[PDB]
Design a protein around this ligand. Structure first.
Ligand SMILES: [Mg+2]
Ligand SMILES: [Mg+2]
Ligand SMILES: [Mg+2]
Ligand SMILES: [Mg+2]
Ligand SMILES: [Mg+2]
Ligand SMILES: [Mg+2]
Length: 190
RNA sequence: CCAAUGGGGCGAAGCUACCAUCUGUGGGAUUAUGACUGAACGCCUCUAAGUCAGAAUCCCGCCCAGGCGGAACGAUAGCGC
């Protein structure tokens, strides 16, 4: 049936000062600014309270499919606040059996050269979205580190190289090779 | 010269043979599929809203023809403003 009211609040930390024009939200703070346009979701955004301490999202007279769309806005706003405060440092491992996967990074995090995967002479030049920085960390042999603010762009850049390092026309249950996401965390801790 | 091209050789030009030689292209949205974020369902989840990769398929290009479709320009005789 049409549920008369569904709502969920987001308590924002004092380091962040959010605002909104219409239904598009912006989140700024220490690391940078992140925007998201909500023109597909059709809800009410109340930015109430002095010092803008909480964001409320209403849905009036919507059945189950639009009631499912209420918590996802809360989740995207909380992910954006987490990206602005802390960030998204996706650590990921290069698993191989025989051939060492040669990974190097061109243009300070914009492109990844992937070489020597199952003895293939073809190289993969996988380009990240601007905003995501790829790097090789210290004290670890096979490691790729993806830094960024937008969880969409960082995890999409992870999925690009994870689907680039795939084994074709073989048994992937035996050939356990490729670069795979290992740790999903933040840049700085809290 | 005649023998309805008399016959037999070689043979210009022209046509001709994968029987000689030359050439045959680039993108877009996407199917299947694999995924990202994320609820419904405190968790999970490729999907519900949103997003990515994606192909002899589809469409466009390149190419062939040019609309009872247009075009700018030139010259306009007893002829136009
Ligand atoms: Mg086989
Ligand atoms: Mg002859
Ligand atoms: Mg001859
Ligand atoms: Mg395409
Ligand atoms: Mg799908
Ligand atoms: Mg796509």
């Amino acid at each position: 049936m049409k549920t008369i009211l569904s709502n969920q609040t987001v308590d924002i930390p004092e380091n962040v000062d959010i605002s909104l024009k219409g239904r598009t939200v912006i989140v700024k703070g220490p690391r940078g600014t992140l925007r998201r346009d909500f023109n597909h979701i059709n809800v009410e955004l109340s930015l109430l309270g002095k010092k803008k301490k909480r964001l409320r999202v209403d849905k009036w007279w919507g059945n189950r499919k639009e009631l499912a769309t209420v918590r996802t806005i809360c989740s995207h706003v909380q992910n954006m606040i987490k990206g602005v405060t802390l960030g998204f440092r996706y650590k990921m491992r290069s698993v191989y059996a025989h051939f060492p996967i040669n990974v190097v990074i061109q243009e300070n995090g914009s492109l990844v050269e992937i070489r020597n995967f199952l003895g293939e002479k073809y190289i993969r030049r996988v380009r990240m979205r601007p905003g995501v920085a790829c790097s090789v960390s210290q004290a670890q042999k096979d490691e790729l580190v993806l830094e960024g603010n937008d969880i969409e762009l960082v995890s999409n850049s992870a999925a690009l190289i994870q689907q680039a390092t795939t084994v074709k026309n073989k048994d992937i249950r035996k050939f356990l090779d490729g670069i795979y996401v290992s740790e999903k965390g933040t840049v700085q801790q809290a």
